[PDB]
Amino acid sequence: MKIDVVTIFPEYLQPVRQSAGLVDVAVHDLRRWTHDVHKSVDDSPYGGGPGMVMKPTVWGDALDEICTSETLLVVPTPAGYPFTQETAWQWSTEDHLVIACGRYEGIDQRVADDAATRMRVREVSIGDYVLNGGEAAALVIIEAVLRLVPGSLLEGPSYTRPPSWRGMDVPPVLLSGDHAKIAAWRAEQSRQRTIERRPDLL
Template sequence: MRIDILTIFPEMFSPLDQSIVGKAQEKEIVEIHKHDFRENADNKQKHVDDMPYGGGQGMLLMPQPIFDTMDKIPHDGARVILMDPAGKRFDQKMAEELAQEEQLVFICGHYEGYDERIKSLVTDEVSLGDFVLTGGEVAATTMIDSVVRLIPGVLGKQASHEDDSFSSGLLEYPQYTRPEDFRGLKVPDVLMSGHHENIRKWRLTESLRKTLERRPDLLENYDANPEEAKILSQLRAQAENPEL
């Protein structure tokens, strides 16, 4: 995958050179190109923003630096993503979808917003959530990290991300490692039993329990199989009557 990032703060993307995403670049599974679109501003002061027509507070990114930067990037068929608080909410499903693409382009803004004409370059307007950040760089970094780890070959095992929270539609079950007893806090006996079927059932139950308690909204459209439906029914009954 090729990823291009349009930003006036390319140094903010240094975390992408570390950890899993950094190793993915070393393996040449993904290549990341950062473009400072201030360098393409056509004014002496290298301004990339100006006051909005019609008045109002704040400054808007001008279209010229963005368009000229895009002209220098090969991007036929690329998904061009504008980081925008008004965009579609980013989630695991979108991450999985974007991981199938050959090229992603991220446009990161600052200031009050964008000249509307910039959106003619864009295929997707995306937001991390209902809050406002200083700029799009942090949001784009988060999205890139989430997407890159899903590309085949980036993680050691396919199951490493298939069992993640949200990948299955449920929150992940609790996990434990050595020591078995730490300050009186013990690993559940079932995980020490070596009985694979009992461990599978325990993990499924705890995943459903965690989701029901912390993110019940995820279950509203979840297509539970008969086994899961039975467990959920039991968990809901227990929640209504703890003595069961």
């Protein structure tokens, strides 16, 4: 798998040089494709309003150079479809991901619209909160996808040694050698924790 990340903060994605030569991850400074001596990457939004919108001419040139017809173009955005584990599984078999990191106010919509006439494009949000930029979302997506590269209910509490620590004992069932019972106990712990923390999953 090849992953190209485009960002105005290239140093952000250097740590995730975490291996083993199975994937290739390359980070590109978006300013490579700017046109002016000021290296401008955004401009005031049409229709008014706060913040800036990233320039289509800059992104268009960047994607033109980096993408191919086989590319899956990932665009993290707070207005995106949800990125889920199912999404990660799907993307883990792709030959080429390109992740376009932009500010939360967005990239000119015509960039994605144009790219979508030539390649597959996925606009996705990693959660119901707002980040200033796509870089952290890129990190999350890269981690979730790459750990799947062949290279329900919540999980309940986990325990390890020692059997007693600061007045708290490991649940005796876990030491019982009754593995059918252990499974049933873990199932109940999962049900209770899911009810408490994520009733939506039920």
